[PDB]
Each structure stands twice: as structure tokens, then as C-alpha cells.
Design a protein around this ligand. Structure first.
Ligand SMILES: Nc1ncnc2c1ncn2[C@@H]1O[C@H](COP(=O)(O)OP(=O)(O)OP(=O)(O)O)[C@@H](O)[C@H]1O
Ligand SMILES: Nc1ncnc2c1ncn2[C@@H]1O[C@H](COP(=O)(O)OP(=O)(O)O)[C@@H](O)[C@H]1O
Ligand SMILES: [Mg+2]
Lengths: 752, 58, 58
């Protein structure tokens, strides 16, 4: 029932916009069965209503080829109603339309640039001659004739707003020419369709603001007053201002904008005077919508605000919203990043009584935003917007708009080198050659920076699953844990249990623990946040734990997000280690981590991965299932894995066929992944002096080989050493053994 | 949740945030049982290690 | 100035010492510079962009 306002049902007056065949600017075609249903006669005049409260008058005719659910009209009427093909309009009879006495029309500047002839005789007289065309004030119609077709705007009619252009009706075109930019602003007016990804939020806002106006008798009979307060909170750039503008534009209300910082005034009494003036102006311009940007800055908590001016501003706002004199027919909307910073009195009923959350756009939501922003642009066949949406993990609608603009600029950069630029005007062939392709979008993606998580920006090491050698089982589990909950939400719903979201990697150094994490950042279509261990700690008393809450809050906002903790042993300890650990601050940080990972809050799609080197010191509460339930041991690579490691490093660099990688793995019993990579580096680095000697020999004769030979490997193995000592190995082996011994019941089988 | 973070035996360290940790416990003590009329407020605490909690709180 | 620039298209508007005419709005002791900044914003939103005129400042 929450989405009851979004739904629509078939009605006789509702008709789908369809292409015209022979219809002019003044007639529309309707099929006979629905004309009988609507009791409409051929030649009758009707009223057509479009989006953003646009009205048009046309003559209804009969067409046997038109569908019962479709109405035929030309492009002129479509532009008049601000509708496109496939839109829904309403048709009703328009009786008592009288013959016009005097109508005033003004041409559009861009349609008359260079036109010096008499507009009346050339265009208006043949267009209206014995045609009895019905017109409405504000209508835009196009007339052919002369050397170029000219558009006109109906600015005045007598009678108004509906009249018939009779033969005795006086038609005059004198007046100030209309400006193209003004018409373009009205054409590009923000409406409900421009908002993407906020269907439920738009539904709530619609029911609160627009529904009371449409059916006031319903509210009078039910005996309640609709809410008069709206509070939209979300990350910056999410589109709260655009939602407010769309609401104020489609509904017949005046949009009045208030900025928090500009209200601030050093003079005593000026700020609340400005607030009063704004409210009185909005009351004068009723219906109106008052929008306040950054309500948190203008109105903080009075008890915590030492400044007198801000406190008096809050009190004035309270009195303006509620007092002895009740404001009527005025809606106040506010946008704030942090809703809890607002004064608690301002959250009361009757004053911002309802709060609506505008969250970070979803994948389909950001795809819809991209579709809306790219509708005016030209798109090639190669480009897929869904790919761009998928690659934009944390981008916001403003970021998407900037991305589209930058990509169009990149197309301009692509075509700039073609033109020699000496001509004042570009030749038409190069003009047509220009187009936007997928490569421009990819370049914009590389250049662009997400704003949801500009604070957590870091270079991408760009590792692939092919880079990692061995660990085939670990690769599959890492891929399944992130992809299954997001790609298959319904599979878990059918089984009715939540997915696991905890992984810990423990093993000897150089075995690929952080290498696996870096591969997750690329392949998965989820946000990735990397935290160095002691990065969160702070000298101040309660700020070490405040950093932990901020990290988990950002991950929850950007869900699905992968939260990777490198060297987890630094922040997680067995607790009660010593009294000198910052006066118990180290113990207190662990407790904050415990609540964030598993507390009394709904579990979002946040996956926590920890890469620890010494796992025995970690708090047992951290390793509990539900926080880090999957403990994966990354050991020293065995003989089979070492071959894969050697092949993985060697695929990029050409090698001689004489080299036997299998023989290297057998001798390299105890080497880790890093130790083998050191042999990889030494082999290529060796004989690099010979490489210069080869090219020097080329210079000598004028006046070493792409494949690395067997000989190069033999010299490199001489310097090879094992970094992980056997004593170190035993420590990890013991911990993994305890896990197997703890479970018991080896080879568990249900009894037959 | 995790009551042991704000509840401590006091005097654990010579310097713990300038004594603010011990001072928070004293404020909690007066709120639960001080010189004020008791209301229908139920305090539930879930602790994982209860041996470090202040004996005055228990 | 802006009207004359629009007339003489293509035109380049250079505003030397932009910080002088339009300093930080909050750090002001007078409404005069505030209204200067506000009117400048209105005219910047008022650019045609079909008359091919743009503004630069140093
Ligand atoms: N299985 C592997 N396949 C390919 N390269 C590997 C593998 N294991 C380690 N390496 C190489 O080791 C180097 C760094 O290893 P990495 O930092 O992932 O180790 P780690 O086990 O996480 O160690 P630590 O905890 O000490 O940082 C890189 O050059 C990487 O290519
Ligand atoms: N849901 C959305 N759909 C389409 N465009 C959006 C959406 N949200 C933001 N935008 C884009 O963001 C830009 C303005 O952002 P704005 O609404 O001013 O941010 P804020 O909400 O912080 O005020 C607009 O150009 C608009 O195209
Ligand atoms: Mg590492």
C-alpha cells in the first residue's frame, strides 16, 4: 500500500501517444469504438492535458487504423503537451469555446533569424485562413512558408484561454521577439521523470505534497490535516534538491530556495528577519514550497550551541513552523547531510514531522540515471550503458552527470585533431563524422573519481585471478562469497537464511594473503575499502573508537562493500594484555569492532576480510562465527602450486622452450610465492648487462635475446634463499592443527 | 552492549585519557542509583568478560 | 559589459582580480559585496551558451 500512488489503472480518457499520419497542428485522430465509448462526435473540440500541467485544444476526428488505446497527433501537439511517443494523456470535451476576437502571437528568434518579410501575410494568414483552428494561450505551433518554417507562441487571446480563430478574428504579430534560452529552460524543466532510482521516496513525497491538493475534500471528510514538513537526508550530490525542484515544478507550487550559510549574519536580528521575510514571500506566492539547504548548519542543537545568533535562529524557525498562528497551505522541505545534528525540537510533529532517506543509488538506479542523462546525447551501437553502470560501483548521480559531460568532451578531443582550425566554420563532413563511442566512456571512467567514498581514494594495483598461482579452492570461495548474495538474493530468500560475510587469511609471509585481496577489488562488482591496521588509532580519548564507527558506517552506506583489514592482529588482541596500552584504549577499540561486526543492527551486504600473520593473538570473539566465520589457512605452496606460480609469472615474459619449470618446483621445496618471484626477478635482471652488450655490438658494426634462456635461470638460483624459516613454519602449522582437533568427529556421517 | 568497555574497576592505569574513563563510571553510578526518584527504567548489560567490571555497578 | 560582450559575439570576458569583487561570502562585513556575488551568480546562470561567449578570470 506504500506504492499506491505510483500505480496506474486503465481509464477511458487515458490514451497512448501515437505517431501521426496526416494530422495537422489542430486535429487529432481517435478510433471509432472509443469515440463511441467517450460519446465524442467527429469535428468536436476537445481538451488535451499533458505533463507539467500543459493543456492543448484540438479537433477530434476518426481513423480506422488507430488503436483503441492510442491517439494520433503530430509533433507540434507533442511539444505543446511536453510528451513523447508512448506517454499517457487525458482527453475530455471542451464545450462553450467562443470565436476569437483578437489573438497575439510572437515568433521564436531562432526561427526568424534573417527573416525580414511581413510575418502575417507570409505565415499567419494562410495558416488560419478558413480553418477555424482552436488555440490556447501559450501554445507553440509551426507554420511552413517563405524560405524557412517559423514557430509562433500564442501569448494573448480574446477570449482566454480558449478561443477559435474565426475569419473575423484579428491576428497580429507585433511585439518583442521571444528568446530561445527562455523557451529552452521551460522545455528542460525538471520533472518527476528526471528523478531516477528513488521510486519509493518519490511516492512518499508525492502522497505528502501533491495528493492533499488534488483531493482536499477527502482530507476534510476524514478529518485530519496533511503533514507540512519534509526532511530529506543523504550524502551530498544524491539529488535531494533535484527531487524538490521536480516536486515544485510538476505540482502547481512556487519553488523558493533558502541556503543555510547565506542566512547567517553578524548583525543582531538580521538572520531571523531574513527567515521571516522568506516565509512571508512564500505565503504571498502560495502555493509554494520552501526548500532549505544545509538545515544542519543553520539550525544546530540549542543546548550544544554556544553562539546566540544560531540559537535565536532555531527559535525563530520553531515559531515560524508552529505557534499561535498556524501556517496554512505552505510546505517546508529541508536537506541535510547529518539529520542528528538538527535540534530535537525541529524533529517534532508539525515541523519536519516526516524524514525521507535518499540513499546512494543502486546499480539499476544508477543505470536509470545514466539513461536519463544520456537521452539528449547521441549514443552509438557499440556502447552499453549497463556496463558503465556496473563499472561505477560508488558513483552518485552528480558523478554520473559529470562522467557523461567529460566523455562528450573526450569525443570533442577525439575530433579536434581532424580539423585544421583555420576556417571560421567546420566543414559539414567532419561535423557529421563526430560521434560518441564506448572508448570515451571508458576514458571518463578512468578519469572520474567517485564522491561517495572521495575520502577513501587509493591507487588500484590491478591484479587479476590469472596473476595468482595456485589456491584454486580459495579463489572459488572468495568469488562465491561476494557474488552469491548480490547476484542471487532470491536463492537465499528461498532457503531463508542469510549468507556468510566473514573471512580470515592466516599464513607465513609471502604466500599471497594480500595478493588475493587485491584481486577481489577488480573482479567483484562491489566497493572495496582497505584499512591498514594501526591507521584507525588516535591519540585522543574517544576518537580511536569513533574512527571504527565511521569506517563501518561508510561500508554500510556503500553496500555491497568489501571491508579488508590488513594486519588484523594490530587492532585485534586477546584483550587485557597490559594496563599501559593507552589506558585501555586498545581494549576499548576491540569492543567497538565487536558491536559493528555483530550487534543489534540489521546486517547489510558488508563483507569483512582480514589478513593476519599471527592469528593466535587475535581475540576469540573476533573469530566467532557471525563475525569471521571462515578461517582459511594460506600455506607455503606445494610442488603442484609452485609450477602454477612459476607459469603465472612467466606468461607475460617470453621464455625459451629449453626451460623446465617442473624441475625448478621440485628443488624449491620450502620457497614461498615471494621467494619464487625473487627468482623470477633475478633471472630477468641477469644478463641485462649482456643486453646492452648486444646492442652495443650493433653500434660497433655500424661504425641479448627476447626469450630468457636456461642459463639465466641457473645463475639466479645461486642467489635464491628461503625467507620463511622452518621455525616460523611450525607456528602456523600448530594453529591449523588446533582447529582440526577442536571440532572432533573426523569423517562425520549420518547413521543409516 | 559490551558493558566492559565503559565499566571498569577504576584505578587500572596511572593515566587513562586523563582520568575520563574513571569519571564516566562515577557518572553512571549516580544515574542508576543516586539521590533521585526511581523510574521504570530497566538497564540490561551484556558483557563478555565480567571479571573486570566495577563491583559498584554489579 | 556582459550585454556588450553578447552583442560582439564571439567575445571573451576577463575579470581581473575576481577575488576583489567577489570575496568569500561568509567573511564579509557588508551586504554590498554579498549582493555583488549574488548578482554575479545570476548572470553566470544567465549565459546564453548559444551566443558562444564565455568568461575567464585571474
Ligand atoms: N601464489 C602466488 N602466486 C603468484 N605470486 C605470488 C603468490 N604468492 C605470493 N606471490 C608474490 O608475492 C609478492 C607479495 O606477496 P604478498 O604481499 O601477497 O604476501 P602475503 O602472504 O600477503 O605476505 P605478508 O602478510 O607478509 O604481507 C608479489 O610479488 C606476489 O606476486
Ligand atoms: N536521482 C537522480 N536522477 C537524475 N539525476 C540526478 C539524481 N540525483 C542527482 N542527480 C544529478 O545531480 C545534479 C545536482 O545534484 P544536487 O541534487 O544539487 O545534489 P544535492 O542533492 O546534494 O543538492 C543534477 O545535475 C542531477 O542531474
Ligand atoms: Mg600482506
Amino acid at each position: 500500500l506504500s506504492t499506491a500512488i505510483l500505480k496506474q489503472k486503465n481509464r477511458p480518457n487515458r490514451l497512448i501517444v501515437d505517431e501521426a499520419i496526416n494530422e495537422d497542428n489542430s486535429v487529432v485522430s481517435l478510433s471509432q469504438p472509443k469515440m463511441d465509448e467517450l460519446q465524442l462526435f467527429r469535428g468536436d473540440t476537445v481538451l488535451l492535458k499533458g505533463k507539467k500541467r500543459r493543456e492543448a485544444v484540438c479537433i477530434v476526428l476518426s481513423d480506422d487504423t488507430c488503436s483503441d488505446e492510442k491517439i494520433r497527433m503530430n509533433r507540434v501537439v507533442r511539444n505543446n503537451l511536453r510528451v513523447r511517443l508512448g506517454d499517457v494523456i487525458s482527453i475530455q470535451p471542451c464545450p462553450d469555446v467562443k470565436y476569437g476576437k483578437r489573438i497575439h502571437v510572437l515568433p521564436i528568434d531562432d526561427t526568424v533569424e534573417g527573416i525580414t518579410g511581413n510575418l502575417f501575410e507570409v505565415y499567419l494568414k494562410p495558416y488560419f485562413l478558413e480553418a477555424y483552428r482552436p488555440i490556447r494561450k501559450g501554445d507553440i505551433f509551426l507554420v511552413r512558408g517563405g524560405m524557412r518554417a517559423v514557430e509562433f507562441k500564442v501569448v494573448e487571446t480574446d477570449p482566454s484561454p480558449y478561443c477559435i480563430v474565426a475569419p473575423d478574428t484579428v491576428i497580429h504579430c507585433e511585439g518583442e521577439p521571444i528568446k530561445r534560452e527562455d523557451e529552452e529552460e521551460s522545455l528542460n524543466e525538471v520533472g518527476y521523470d528526471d528523478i531516477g532510482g528513488c521510486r519509493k521516496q518519490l511516492a512518499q513525497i508525492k502522497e505528502m505534497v501533491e495528493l492533499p491538493l488534488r483531493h482536499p475534500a477527502l482530507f476534510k471528510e476524514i478529518g485530519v490535516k496533511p503533514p507540512r514538513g519534509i526532511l530529506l537526508y543523504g550524502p551530498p550530490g544524491t539529488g535531494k534538491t533535484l527531487i524538490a525542484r521536480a516536486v515544485a515544478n510538476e505540482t502547481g507550487a512556487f519553488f523558493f530556495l533558502i541556503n543555510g550559510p547565506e542566512i547567517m549574519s553578524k548583525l543582531a536580528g538580521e538572520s531571523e528577519s531574513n527567515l521571516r521575510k522568506a516565509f512571508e514571500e512564500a505565503e504571498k506566492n502560495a502555493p509554494a514550497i520552501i526548500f532549505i539547504d544545509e538545515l544542519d548548519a543553520i539550525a544546530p542543537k540549542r543546548e550544544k550551541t554556544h553562539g546566540e545568533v544560531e540559537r535565536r535562529i532555531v527559535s525563530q524557525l520553531l515559531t515560524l513552523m508552529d505557534g499561535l498562528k498556524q501556517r496554512a497551505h505552505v510546505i517546508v522541505m529541508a536537506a541535510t547531510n547529518r539529520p542528528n545534528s538538527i535540534d530535537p525540537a525541529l524533529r517534532r510533529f508539525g515541523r519536519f514531522d516526516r524524514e525521507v532517506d535518499i540513499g546512494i543509488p543502486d546499480a539499476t538506479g544508477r543505470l536509470e540515471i545514466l539513461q536519463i542523462h544520456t537521452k539528449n546525447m547521441k549514443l552509438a551501437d557499440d556502447v552499453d550503458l549497463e556496463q558503465v553502470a556496473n563499472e561505477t560501483h560508488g558513483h552518485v548521480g552528480a558523478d554520473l552527470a559529470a562522467l557523461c559531460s567529460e566523455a562528450a568532451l573526450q569525443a570533442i578531443r577525439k575530433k579536434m585533431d581532424l580539423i585544421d582550425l583555420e576556417d571560421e566554420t567546420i566543414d559539414a563532413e567532419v561535423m557529421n563524422s563526430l560521434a560518441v563511442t564506448m572508448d570515451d566512456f571508458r576514458w571518463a571512467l578512468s578519469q572520474s573519481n567517485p564522491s561517495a567514498l572521495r575520502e577513501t581514494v587509493v591507487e588500484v594495483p590491478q591484479v587479476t585471478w590469472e596473476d595468482i598461482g595456485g589456491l584454486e579452492d580459495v579463489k572459488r570461495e572468495l568469488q562465491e562469497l561476494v557474488q552469491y548474495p548480490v547476484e542471487h538474493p532470491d536463492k537465499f530468500l528461498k532457503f531463508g537464511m542469510t549468507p556468510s560475510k566473514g573471512v580470515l587469511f592466516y599464513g607465513p609471509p609471502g604466500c599471497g594473503k594480500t595478493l588475493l585481496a587485491k584481486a577481489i577489488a577488480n573482479e567483484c562488482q562491489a566497493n572495496f575499502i582497505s584499512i591498514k591496521g594501526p591507521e584507525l588509532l588516535t591519540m585522543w580519548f574517544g576518537e580511536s573508537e569513533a574512527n571504527v564507527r565511521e569506517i563501518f558506517d561508510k561500508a554500510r552506506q556503500a553496500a555491497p562493500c568489501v571491508l579488508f583489514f590488513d594486519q588484523l592482529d594490530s587492532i585485534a588482541k586477546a584483550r587485557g594484555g597490559n594496563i599501559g596500552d593507552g589506558g585501555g584504549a586498545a581494549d576499548r577499540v576491540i569492543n567497538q569492532i565487536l558491536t559493528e561486526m555483530d550487534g543489534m543492527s540489521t546486517k547489510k551486504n558488508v563483507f569483512i576480510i582480514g589478513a593476519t600473520n599471527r592469528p593466535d593473538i587475535i581475540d576469540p570473539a573476533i573469530l566467532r562465527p557471525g563475525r569471521l566465520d571462515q578461517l582459511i589457512y594460506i600455506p607455503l605452496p606445494d610442488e603442484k602450486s609452485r609450477v602454477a606460480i612459476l607459469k603465472a609469472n612467466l606468461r607475460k615474459s617470453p621464455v625459451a622452450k629449453d626451460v623446465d619449470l617442473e624441475f625448478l618446483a621440485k628443488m624449491t621445496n620450502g620457497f614461498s610465492g615471494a621467494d619464487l618471484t625473487e627468482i623470477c626477478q633475478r633471472a630477468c635482471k641477469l644478463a641485462i648487462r649482456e643486453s646492452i652488450e648486444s646492442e652495443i655490438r650493433r653500434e660497433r658494426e655500424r661504425q641479448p635475446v627476447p626469450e630468457i634462456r636456461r642459463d639465466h635461470f641457473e645463475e639466479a638460483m645461486r642467489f635464491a634463499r628461503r625467507s620463511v624459516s622452518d621455525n616460523d613454519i611450525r607456528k602456523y602449522e600448530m594453529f591449523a592443527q588446533t582447529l582440526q582437533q577442536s571440532r572432533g568427529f573426523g569423517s562425520f556421517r549420518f547413521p543409516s
